[PDB]
Amino acid sequence: YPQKNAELLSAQYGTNLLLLGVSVMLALAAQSGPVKEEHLLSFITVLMLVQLVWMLCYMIRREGASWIRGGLTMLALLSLIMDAFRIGYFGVYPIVHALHTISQVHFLWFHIKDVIKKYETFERFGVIHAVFTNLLLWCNGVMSVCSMFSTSLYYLYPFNIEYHIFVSAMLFGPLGGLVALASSVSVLVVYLIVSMFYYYGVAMMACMCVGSGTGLLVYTLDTELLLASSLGSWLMSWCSVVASVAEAGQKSPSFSWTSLTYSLLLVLEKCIQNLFIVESLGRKRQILKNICMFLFMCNISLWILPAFGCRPQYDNPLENETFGTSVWTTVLNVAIPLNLFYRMHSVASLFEVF
Amino acid sequence: YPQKNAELLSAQYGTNLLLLGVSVMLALAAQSGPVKEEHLLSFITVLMLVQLVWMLCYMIRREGASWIRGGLTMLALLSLIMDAFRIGYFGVYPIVHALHTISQVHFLWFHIKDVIKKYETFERFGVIHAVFTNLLLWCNGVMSVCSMFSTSLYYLYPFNIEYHIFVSAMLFGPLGGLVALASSVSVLVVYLIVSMFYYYGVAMMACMCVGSGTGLLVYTLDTELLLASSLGSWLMSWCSVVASVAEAGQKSPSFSWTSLTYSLLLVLEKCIQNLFIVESLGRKRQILKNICMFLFMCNISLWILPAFGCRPQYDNPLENETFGTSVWTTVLNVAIPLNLFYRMHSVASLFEVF
Numbered sequence: 001y002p003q004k005n006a007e008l009l010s011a012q013y014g015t016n017l018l019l020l021g022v023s024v025m026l027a028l029a030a031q032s033g034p035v036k037e038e039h040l041l042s043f044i045t046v047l048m049l050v051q052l053v054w055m056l057c058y059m060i061r062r063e064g065a066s067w068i069r070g071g072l073t074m075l076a077l078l079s080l081i082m083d084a085f086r087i088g089y090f091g092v093y094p095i096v097h098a099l100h101t102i103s104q105v106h107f108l109w110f111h112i113k114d115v116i117k118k119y120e121t122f123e124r125f126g127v128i129h130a131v132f133t134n135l136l137l138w139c140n141g142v143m144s145v146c147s148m149f150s151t152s153l154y155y156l157y158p159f160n161i162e163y164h165i166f167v168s169a170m171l172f173g174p175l176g177g178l179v180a181l182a183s184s185v186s187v188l189v190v191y192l193i194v195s196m197f198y199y200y201g202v203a204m205m206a207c208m209c210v211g212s213g214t215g216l217l218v219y220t221l222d223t224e225l226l227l228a229s230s231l232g233s234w235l236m237s238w239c240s241v242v243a244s245v246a247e248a249g250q251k252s253p254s255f256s257w258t259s260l261t262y263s264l265l266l267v268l269e270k271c272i273q274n275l276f277i278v279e280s281l282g283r284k285r286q287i288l289k290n291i292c293m294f295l296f297m298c299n300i301s302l303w304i305l306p307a308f309g310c311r312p313q314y315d316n317p318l319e320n321e322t323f324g325t326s327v328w329t330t331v332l333n334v335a336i337p338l339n340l341f342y343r344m345h346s347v348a349s350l351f352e353v354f
Numbered sequence: 355y356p357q358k359n360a361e362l363l364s365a366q367y368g369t370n371l372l373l374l375g376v377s378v379m380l381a382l383a384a385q386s387g388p389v390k391e392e393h394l395l396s397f398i399t400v401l402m403l404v405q406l407v408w409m410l411c412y413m414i415r416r417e418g419a420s421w422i423r424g425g426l427t428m429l430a431l432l433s434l435i436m437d438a439f440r441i442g443y444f445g446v447y448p449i450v451h452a453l454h455t456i457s458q459v460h461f462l463w464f465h466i467k468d469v470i471k472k473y474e475t476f477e478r479f480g481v482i483h484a485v486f487t488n489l490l491l492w493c494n495g496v497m498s499v500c501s502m503f504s505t506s507l508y509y510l511y512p513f514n515i516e517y518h519i520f521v522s523a524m525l526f527g528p529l530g531g532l533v534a535l536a537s538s539v540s541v542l543v544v545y546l547i548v549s550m551f552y553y554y555g556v557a558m559m560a561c562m563c564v565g566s567g568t569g570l571l572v573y574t575l576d577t578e579l580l581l582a583s584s585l586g587s588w589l590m591s592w593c594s595v596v597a598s599v600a601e602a603g604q605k606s607p608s609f610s611w612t613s614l615t616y617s618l619l620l621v622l623e624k625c626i627q628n629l630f631i632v633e634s635l636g637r638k639r640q641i642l643k644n645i646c647m648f649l650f651m652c653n654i655s656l657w658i659l660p661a662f663g664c665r666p667q668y669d670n671p672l673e674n675e676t677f678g679t680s681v682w683t684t685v686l687n688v689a690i691p692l693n694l695f696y697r698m699h700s701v702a703s704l705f706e707v708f
């Protein structure tokens with residue numbers, strides 16, 4: 001049997017798998033009579049069950065990496081406690097999801113590395129199924145003692161979405177840094193006990209742009225992953241830029257050239273850092289070392305801030321009136337958990353450079 | 355200067371170019387105060403002007419293929435008369451668009467082939483700009499004597515969108531066939547002078563599936579283009595399948611197992627034909643020849659039918675109540691002009707096989 005056809009036929013299966021999801025999601029976004037949320041939960045439940053069964057059949061037949069695995073396991077633990085909370089609240093979906101999570105963690109830990117290397121068409125259909133089950137659970141995620149459950153679900157939400165992003169992915173000077181690490185926590189605490197976030201972010205992004213530009217002046221999977229994760233922040237930034245300029249057209253002190261500069265600096269920071277990292281992969285070596293140090297000790301600060309819930313973007317009245325509550329909320333729900341992945345990738349890459 | 359960075363930096367530019375569009379489109383879909391349609395028209399007008407200027411600078415510095423060029427030129431002629439009608443109705447956009455169309459046609463005809471071969475960073479930024487200007491004009495297209503203008507704009511609409519698809523692309527037995535060619539016109543005329551369309555399509559897709567399957571039993575850019583264009587019909591089909599099943603849950607004779615079979619056959623037909631074509635690229639040779647003949651003389655029939663305006667899908671009350679008028683309309687607006695590209699590609703490929 002020619003094996004190229006398996007790549008094509010499986011690929012067609014995979015895209016039909018995604019497109020069926022889109023159809024059921026579209027019929028749900030419309031909030032029409034015939035399609036209810038339970039139909040989407042049933043659908044994906046059926047896809048997880050199919051996956052589990054595939055893994056069981058595989059086990060029957062068989063009669064950098066450290067950072068990736070650590071991130072995967074910790075995200076899995078958070079996505080599993082997310083289900084412990086859902087199950088505690090009361091349906092069926094959180095149980096199949098918990099089983100799926102446990103399965104994925106185990107398979108990725110022990111087999112995806114080299115066991116799968118020797119393969120034919122069974123694995124080619126299995127992997128595509130897993131990729132489009134995860135990449136469709138991220139869709140469902142993004143779309144979707146009462147205060148105890150609400151608080152825990154809030155804090156765990158970006159980690160469940162990031163979990164799905166991370167699994168999708170796999171299946172398919174120094175003094176300023178050290179001060180910044182303490183400042184991140186200080187900003188978080190004072191926020192919990194708005195404008196400080198934007199001022200901190202602008203100052204931090206300007207310093208990062210200067211550092212990375214200096215490093216460039218002194219001078220394929222990683223580049224693609226950096227760009228793929230960068231798109232979340234780029235979308236969020238351009239939404240803020242469009243709303244800020246549109247309001248700036250009329251008489252309004254809303255923007256105060258602080259949300260526009262912030263958004264443009266975020267775009268510039270990412271566009272420069274991606275090149276610095278890609279290029280990195282006698283007296284000048286020390287400054288390059290200081291650049292690598294100051295940069296990842298800064299990356300961590302901007303990764304802790306959204307990770308611990310200080311995110312003020314959901315409370316912005318400008319881009320909610322401009323884009324709509326559900327649209328702006330969804331855009332933030334996409335950009336935030338992907339940004340939490342990008343920053344860790346950046347830290348690990350800069351560390352390995354150093 | 356290292357040239358790899360140009361690929362990365364230009365790529366970042368290109369995706370930011372797309373994301374800015376998305377932001378302005380999102381602020382427009384919301385139909386909020388600050389963003390009007392004129393801001394989107396101004397935006398893209400600015401991008402075309404930039405492109406034109408790029409081409410002028412390029413000309414200053416310089417001090418299968420037949421089917422592709424023919425399709426491009428005829429689509430350009432239809433997209434240009436589209437502007438002749440818009441200009442006749444009265445702003446600025448149709449004039450810049452006409453200039454853009456004339457530019458593209460000329461550049462693609464004489465230079466894109468080999469003149470650009472010798473290049474550095476100017477061309478790398480130029481091509482990405484052109485790709486994301488066209489691939490964003492397709493977005494605007496899809497979203498958007500009065501009866502004379504309405505009639506002409508209706509008939510020319512799929513050809514303007516297909517024009518943008520085609521340009522995006524480039525920048526980045528026998529007796530049954532002969533009868534089918536006459537039947538396509540007969541069906542078109544009787545439709546203009548509904549159920550016949552669905553019965554014809556079901557009969558035709560079942561015959562195509564049998565032919566292609568038989569050919570497979572007897573036994574990289576083209577495969578990717580076939581899949582990329584197939585996704586339009588796959589989305590449209592899964593929308594019909596989801597709405598049909600959801601209605602089938604309740605007591606309803608709407609589906610009548612004619613829209614569900616049609617949609618599933620369309621998916622199967624495409625999934626089998628894509629493999630037949632990819633595999634194709636003593637006594638059994640004659641049947642294979644008959645298969646190639648019967649198939650492209652059938653492909654043409656299903657390409658003439660939507661091309662000449664017999665498309666009844668816009669009048670479906672089921673998938674408009676199920677998905678919403680604007681959503682179902684948009685889905686058809688995507689699937690139809692892409693399907694018109696797929697079928698021509700299929701005919702040209704089968705012809706070359708024969």
Ligand SMILES: CC(C)CCC[C@@H](C)[C@H]1CC[C@H]2[C@@H]3CC=C4C[C@@H](OC(=O)CCC(=O)O)CC[C@]4(C)[C@H]3CC[C@]12C
Pocket residue numbers: 022025026029030135139681
């Ligand atoms: C890298 C490749 C394999 C995937 C590319 C990312 C996808 C996961 C993205 C691409 C476009 C996205 C889709 C864009 C638009 C919509 C429409 C949206 O429907 C709406 O609610 C709009 C208004 C309405 O219809 O109510 C629901 C999510 C969905 C299907 C999307 C979910 C995420 C998708 C599939």
Ligand SMILES: CC(C)CCC[C@@H](C)[C@H]1CC[C@H]2[C@@H]3CC=C4C[C@@H](OC(=O)CCC(=O)O)CC[C@]4(C)[C@H]3CC[C@]12C
Pocket residue numbers: 029143231235326327330331373376
């Ligand atoms: C990588 C490149 C080449 C692809 C670029 C595609 C992105 C620009 C897409 C992918 C995900 C999309 C988003 C995914 C889903 C939605 C859902 C939609 O929200 C709704 O569900 C409708 C509101 C309601 O619930 O009524 C608004 C559009 C938005 C934010 C989409 C906007 C466009 C995005 C960012």
Ligand SMILES: CC(C)CCC[C@@H](C)[C@H]1CC[C@H]2[C@@H]3CC=C4C[C@@H](OC(=O)CCC(=O)O)CC[C@]4(C)[C@H]3CC[C@]12C
Pocket residue numbers: 327376379380383384489493
């Ligand atoms: C092959 C690569 C380079 C591109 C992939 C195809 C894109 C051209 C597609 C992918 C997802 C699509 C987007 C999906 C979702 C939306 C949301 C949509 O906004 C809505 O109207 C939803 C509800 C609302 O917000 O009112 C407008 C079109 C847009 C931006 C899309 C336009 C076409 C996009 C960018």
Ligand SMILES: CC(C)CCC[C@@H](C)[C@H]1CC[C@H]2[C@@H]3CC=C4C[C@@H](OC(=O)CCC(=O)O)CC[C@]4(C)[C@H]3CC[C@]12C
Pocket residue numbers: 019022383497585589680681684685
């Ligand atoms: C190639 C693979 C890996 C990517 C799959 C992405 C598709 C599933 C995306 C690309 C284009 C998207 C469509 C582009 C734009 C819209 C606009 C949106 O319509 C609106 O503008 C909102 C209605 C209003 O105007 O109020 C509804 C979703 C829809 C049909 C999107 C549904 C999801 C689609 C088909």
Ligand SMILES: CC(C)CCC[C@@H](C)[C@H]1CC[C@H]2[C@@H]3CC[C@@H]4C[C@@H](O)CC[C@]4(C)[C@H]3CC[C@]12C
Pocket residue numbers: 077078148151152155
């Ligand atoms: C990885 C895991 C083993 C340890 C850390 C992950 C955290 C996200 C988890 C671990 C246990 C969780 C806590 C237990 C229950 C709590 C209810 C209420 O009072 C506010 C949130 C509340 C205090 C939770 C916040 C998030 C926590 C702290």
Ligand SMILES: CC(C)CCC[C@@H](C)[C@H]1CC[C@H]2[C@@H]3CC[C@@H]4C[C@@H](O)CC[C@]4(C)[C@H]3CC[C@]12C
Pocket residue numbers: 071074075155159307308
């Ligand atoms: C690798 C990475 C994915 C791990 C992330 C772990 C964090 C999400 C965990 C670690 C410890 C947790 C905190 C401890 C208890 C806290 C008190 C109460 O107000 C609820 C939030 C509260 C402040 C928690 C927020 C989430 C934290 C910060």
Ligand SMILES: CC(C)CCC[C@@H](C)[C@H]1CC[C@H]2[C@@H]3CC[C@@H]4C[C@@H](O)CC[C@]4(C)[C@H]3CC[C@]12C
Pocket residue numbers: 431432502505506509
């Ligand atoms: C390529 C081009 C040179 C020739 C064919 C392309 C067609 C899509 C174009 C050519 C001229 C166009 C016609 C001229 C004006 C007409 C107004 C009204 O009575 C109904 C539509 C109306 C009759 C148009 C239909 C579409 C036509 C027929």
Ligand SMILES: CC(C)CCC[C@@H](C)[C@H]1CC[C@H]2[C@@H]3CC[C@@H]4C[C@@H](O)CC[C@]4(C)[C@H]3CC[C@]12C
Pocket residue numbers: 425428429509513661662
């Ligand atoms: C290569 C490909 C992109 C070329 C497509 C050309 C067609 C769109 C053109 C060719 C001739 C045109 C027809 C001639 C006049 C017609 C009478 C009136 O009722 C308006 C529609 C009317 C029936 C036209 C529909 C569009 C046609 C069929």
